[PDB]
Scaffold this active site. Structure first.
Site, short mmCIF file in Angstrom:
data_model
loop_
_atom_site.label_atom_id
_atom_site.label_comp_id
_atom_site.label_asym_id
_atom_site.label_seq_id
_atom_site.Cartn_x
_atom_site.Cartn_y
_atom_site.Cartn_z
CE1 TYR A 168 -18.59 36.28 23.61
CE2 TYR A 168 -19.87 38.04 22.45
CZ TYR A 168 -19.61 36.61 23.03
OH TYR A 168 -19.55 35.89 21.92
CG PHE A 220 -14.44 39.78 12.70
CD1 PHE A 220 -14.37 38.93 13.36
CD2 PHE A 220 -14.64 41.11 12.40
CE1 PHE A 220 -13.99 39.39 14.82
CE2 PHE A 220 -13.93 41.60 13.55
CZ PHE A 220 -14.14 40.24 14.61
C1 LIG Z 1 -23.54 35.61 14.71
C2 LIG Z 1 -23.39 35.83 13.02
N1 LIG Z 1 -22.44 35.06 12.56
C3 LIG Z 1 -21.69 33.75 12.12
C4 LIG Z 1 -21.95 32.52 11.56
C5 LIG Z 1 -22.14 36.00 11.48
C6 LIG Z 1 -20.94 36.62 11.39
C7 LIG Z 1 -20.73 37.09 10.45
C8 LIG Z 1 -20.37 36.42 8.79
C9 LIG Z 1 -19.79 37.73 7.71
N2 LIG Z 1 -19.24 35.63 9.14
C10 LIG Z 1 -18.96 34.60 8.95
C11 LIG Z 1 -20.05 34.24 7.56
C12 LIG Z 1 -19.88 32.77 7.89
N3 LIG Z 1 -19.08 32.19 7.77
C13 LIG Z 1 -18.39 32.13 8.94
C14 LIG Z 1 -17.40 31.19 9.46
C15 LIG Z 1 -16.53 31.27 10.32
CL1 LIG Z 1 -15.23 30.16 11.01
C16 LIG Z 1 -16.60 32.74 10.60
C17 LIG Z 1 -16.97 33.88 10.44
C18 LIG Z 1 -17.83 33.73 9.30
#
Ligand SMILES: CCN(CC)CCC[C@@H](C)Nc1ccnc2cc(Cl)ccc12
Ligand SMILES: CCN(CC)CCC[C@@H](C)Nc1ccnc2cc(Cl)ccc12
Ligand SMILES: CCN(CC)CCC[C@@H](C)Nc1ccnc2cc(Cl)ccc12
Ligand SMILES: CCN(CC)CCC[C@@H](C)Nc1ccnc2cc(Cl)ccc12
Lengths: 390, 390, 390, 390
Positions: free
Chosen positions: B119, B390
């Site tokens: 990034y 997130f």
């Molecule tokens: C990189 C790994 N990921 C992506 C699913 C988890 C990141 C941390 C968690 C709490 N975030 C998430 C967990 C589950 N679903 C989601 C849907 C959206 Cl649009 C955005 C974030 C999300």
């Protein structure tokens, strides 16, 4: 149970206690170089007849913020026999050496601690932070901004003069820097050669303004351990790491460095320089509060301020800090800041923030503005590093 | 290969790519709460027909130094199909979302990075530091100075109101703090219960001014993992750790915290709070340099100064900092400081010193006094923490 | 902070403290069977309002040497909240339950200890020894002398009647034997079935005079764990081990047994039955010294002898042992033997020799002949085993 | 393939087979001290020309219950070439040495076994039990009852006289005790010094009535291994363990001891002394059943009894035991007890109970009262220990 300065007849009993107390201690030949640094009356022994306790200090020169060099009592070779625990021997030995150190006129004492729970109660605070970085050098790429996109691979014993000169420049410009006497260079270069069923040979990378001493690990043949990297310029630091990352037969390069080592920022992936270990390095006991606070330089950015600092059983002082200098004079005026002596040692080289110590109640004030001013003033422009263990 | 905002018909293909890209992603029910935070036009998909790339941003509120709350675009759910690597999909998706984010008027974007080498080239700098402490609680004794020598053991779902109120106070007073919407509290409290062949039950320790959420590890039954400790006062932080150290059936308590966590200083042996892991937390892309630099508060200790800052492809600005405030106006005057956009993100919450970035050539100036002034001004009084991933 | 018998309204707070204190504790359904064994006034709670401490005893029947069955108070569900450590809660709860147990007329109390350093100071001594044997069954060959050179592989739930009858015979003939109530058979047979992401199915090997309950380990698929083997005859013990050694898909069979398990002697290589773990099992507090010493049978081999035994704060008694029986009457005559109450508990089932406790100064006499006579008399013909944890 | 006493010309071939068979075997210098203990005609070799098999016995003195010292044939240096397995060499060598040992008038032979499945069939039974205890000395606190709440830390080579005198007292008073000749003290004290890429230096703790020899582990620098602790009094045993627990730089102290070591009972937490390993120690072949049974002392507690003992291919004897003495005379009266020779060796020093061997069918009688009487009579007042491996 008597406590005395040792005679030459006490040293065999001291070497037995040493061998039994310190795994790193090969035999009397080890202590020879270090003993040249112990002054007359630098040592105490407890006899029960045999040696059941010992402790000593060496004459050191320690760099503090502002490039100021303080005479420093380096406590070392501290041991109580396993037969004589819980008899107050350590307390009695530390009380006697501290009396001698203070009377001799040292403003500070320093040590490396075998455990973290012992020396706080005798007034020592952890003052530097050891930070081990392990680089997976197979993925390491230098950032477009990194300098040097000048180093030689050499045998350490063949370039003693250049290592000595580079280290001398580094130790004078870096807080935590210690003068290294010729006898400790003799020791260092003796450890550079391979040992039968012991360490592998050490190599050096040599730049005009820095050097790195490294050796492949005994058992993990894909790990190179950097024992010491001393760089006087950013260009030398970057050039040396380009060469270390060029050790194509290694998977991993590890170094014991300081928390502000810029290495991670030299890479396209900062996460490649993993923190694998952290620990207290040098501990500092402020022996004379006013001499120590007046000796060090302070941040020019913070405007002039005055306060009253009480060290628990160490005096109360009117402390005025401005233009990067402190004046620290006796007062009976009401204390605005209170802390134990060990806390002051922890603040002294800039390794720990007053605000952090305050949040644990180690530092006590009712003025948040005074806390911000102390934090800023005690901060060190040049990040504190750890020289060499003693 | 087209790049579009997804229709409701695209979301099944996005959930397939998600399931295949993110091990933490259970299924569509996961995304429901987070999707309430995605604005109209917050998402892009690349179609080849099936979804081979996606990315979106959520509407967040991020606390920055001076207790200032910024509207923040939280990038998330970023994935390229393993069939479509090296086709420029990530670059094209990031360019489009950045266009939308900037046009919508967000001063900053933020993300959590799956790898550390991706990034930087899109202008994101690591801005918070995750610091895992593991305490061997069998040896942990509190220091005589530690406060509280007021906490209840509770079921999280039964005290939702109190957790919500404590977190809201903490997120407004701490840089890195993020507003947590009700839908994310619903998620959090759903994860608090035991799962068949999954996590064990979570318990809470509740103080009027703090809470700790913890659960025994799945496999290591002598390890308690603190998922979140939010303390608004030093008294609450100390009281909560006294209770955690009271988990007599555990050997070890681990927490992902920040580098200035005062925990170690609460103990007689600071070494007992071992750093077992370190990593970048929140990454920050400054979208509008002048809006961001004017919004945050600055250290009052540093006296008024003016300089000219160039961000590589981000503008050149007359930057005046005094009385804790910045004014940042267009100029064509000669640059005194230059840095890439990502470097500014890394400085912005106080987690990285200008001096450290300068020593790696990431920040470029010919004035060492200006460097000291930037370091001091960008420093944060309240240490930067990481809210929630997130 | 009050200490009371709990009302039905206290039990939700007790289940919360239980869940947070005991990793094995699934939820209220767990406690249901065990609660049928807790008498009216068998439980205490400390309230601060919420439950911060609890402890209870169950009505048990314990077999002691001579095949004598004693009513036994089984202490269990003992927990202090992590918020309320070092407030004397455990001491206050144990003092109250001991008062009730003694007044109710129980001659002995018993517990399983979560740690080995807690219960000694309340008068409990370790009284049985858990001994884990791991057999590498790929090398195991039976000795020519071994019997049976009669067992069925069965589903436990289909043969409840036969397991119940075999266990009842075993528990009456073995010191350490405990009566198992129908509700604990319900529990045991419920744990016999596979759990989603939990334990694998349990199988049984059934002989007319013994049974073995075993299940393959969750993760190590070449390890079979024997949860319980109850053999009333040597022929059944040998026949069951021939069948376990017939588990040709396993590398290793482990069992938690007792130090005198004859298994190793059944093999041509005794070293194949490796001791992989040892620990205290049942702990015993003698509540009434004379009732307990008169109840148990003694070795017939030692001739009649008389002595005077003092238990520290437990009375002084004229102790006469002959023809396998003790008479134990009040005296103020000079003590010939002294020991703390916990030491007597450790001697009581024959698991620890008086001579061994004497060599650590736990047992004190000036007569070596009296020591040999105590050792011989307290020895148990039938080796002490551990029934089931409570 | 001939079987002969070796000439001096055979010993180079024997040292080659030794080096290839025994990892502990450095070279001929090793065997020099041990060879002084081998009598004329104490050795056999099998030649194919080169040595393909060898075995010998040393003249030892073994302490048995009643403080009786027996002349003992110590079998050692037993090896068959990997080229010559399954040719009956071991059987032929053992048959010849046993013939010589019996004709020379030794009542018992003894060995240490490299594997547990070999020597049973030649009449050897495991007779002592090695029990490794590992103490986590960081938690170890001595019980209020423990004595000594007198030891010196010394170099072993400087106190040879005192170690020799303490060991001589211990070996005469302890069953399993072996006389240690001066040549084995020479060996022991030579192994006390550090080796390049080998063991670390050994230290001693010396009490008037005991000594402990210990050394830090080669690789685990927080583990101290006690190679030998010989204590003639309970006070010396406790005093020595107080000193070992005073090795504050160690996490763990390990010792190979016996099952009745009182160490655990010296601590407030008996569980801290963990059994980490168990194995057969000394093995014993009774060469002359009546000479051996009459030589040892028996428990005075059991009243006079008579029986008829058959050893499989070892004779049938009228055995009368009373007043701690046995009379063992030829009979053709019906056997009341039968066992193989190896089983008798296992009973002989009190390490294994007749009842335990009976439950595996190794010992055969139809009288449970006779079994209890044998158990009691063969029990040893002083617990059996293991002297030194040979
Ligand atoms: C990189 C790994 N990921 C992506 C699913 C988890 C990141 C941390 C968690 C709490 N975030 C998430 C967990 C589950 N679903 C989601 C849907 C959206 Cl649009 C955005 C974030 C999300
Ligand atoms: C605590 C472990 N120890 C003490 C031997 C090693 C510390 C670091 C090393 C470089 N210091 C030393 C190593 C060897 N010998 C020495 C003799 C004296 Cl007087 C002082 C310091 C010494
Ligand atoms: C110390 C760990 N614990 C306590 C729950 C488990 C001990 C062994 C198991 C079989 N005992 C138990 C398991 C489950 N619930 C119970 C309820 C009561 Cl009142 C008593 C004992 C119980
Ligand atoms: C089975 C492994 N071995 C045999 C060398 C070591 C046993 C224990 C050690 C102390 N014994 C010995 C060690 C070294 N050499 C020796 C020579 C003879 Cl004749 C007898 C015993 C010996």
């Amino acid at each position: 149970v008597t406590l005395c300065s040792p005679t030459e007849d006490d040293w065999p009993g001291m070497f037995l206690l040493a061998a039994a107390s310190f795994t790193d201690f090969i035999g009397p030949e080890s202590a020879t170089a270090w003993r040249t640094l112990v002054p007359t009356d630098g040592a105490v022994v407890v006899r029960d007849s045999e040696v059941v306790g010992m402790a000593l200090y060496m004459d050191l020169r320690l760099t503090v913020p502002g490039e100021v060099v303080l005479p420093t009592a380096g406590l070392s070779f501290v041991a109580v026999a396993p037969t004589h625990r819980r008899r107050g021997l350590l307390r009695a030995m530390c009380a006697e050496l501290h009396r001698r150190i203070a009377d001799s006129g040292y403003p500070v004492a320093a040590l490396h601690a075998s455990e973290g729970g012992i020396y706080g109660r005798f007034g020592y605070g952890p003052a530097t932070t050891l930070h081990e970085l392990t680089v997976d050098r197979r993925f390491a790429r230098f950032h477009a901004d990194a300098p040097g996109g000048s180093v030689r691979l050499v045998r350490p014993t063949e370039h003693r003069g250049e290592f000595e000169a580079i280290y001398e420049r580094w130790r004078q410009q870096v807080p935590g820097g210690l003068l290294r006497p010729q006898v400790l260079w003799d020791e260092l270069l003796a450890e550079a050669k391979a040992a039968p069923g012991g360490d592998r040979e050490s190599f050096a990378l040599l730049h005009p303004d820095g050097y790195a001493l490294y050796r492949v690990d005994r058992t993990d043949l894909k790990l190179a351990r950097v024992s010491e990297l001393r760089a006087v310029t950013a260009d030398a630091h970057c050039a040396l790491w380009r060469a270390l990352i060029g050790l194509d037969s290694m998977e991993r390069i590890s170094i014991i460095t300081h928390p502000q080592d810029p290495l991670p920022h030299l890479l396209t992936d900062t996460r490649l320089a993993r923190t694998t270990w952290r620990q207290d390095g040098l501990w500092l006991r402020i022996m004379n509060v006013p001499a120590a606070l007046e000796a060090r330089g302070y941040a020019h950015e913070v405007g002039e301020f005055s306060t009253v600092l009480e060290v628990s059983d160490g005096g109360r002082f009117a402390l005025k800090i401005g233009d990067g200098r402190a004046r620290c004079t006796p007062t009976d005026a009401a204390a605005e800041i209170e802390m134990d002596r060990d806390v002051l040692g922890s603040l002294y080289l800039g390794a720990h923030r007053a605000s952090t110590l305050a949040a644990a109640n180690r530092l006590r004030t009712k003025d948040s503005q005074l806390l911000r001013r102390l934090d800023a003033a005690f901060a060190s422009d040049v990040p504190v590093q750890t020289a060499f263990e003693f």
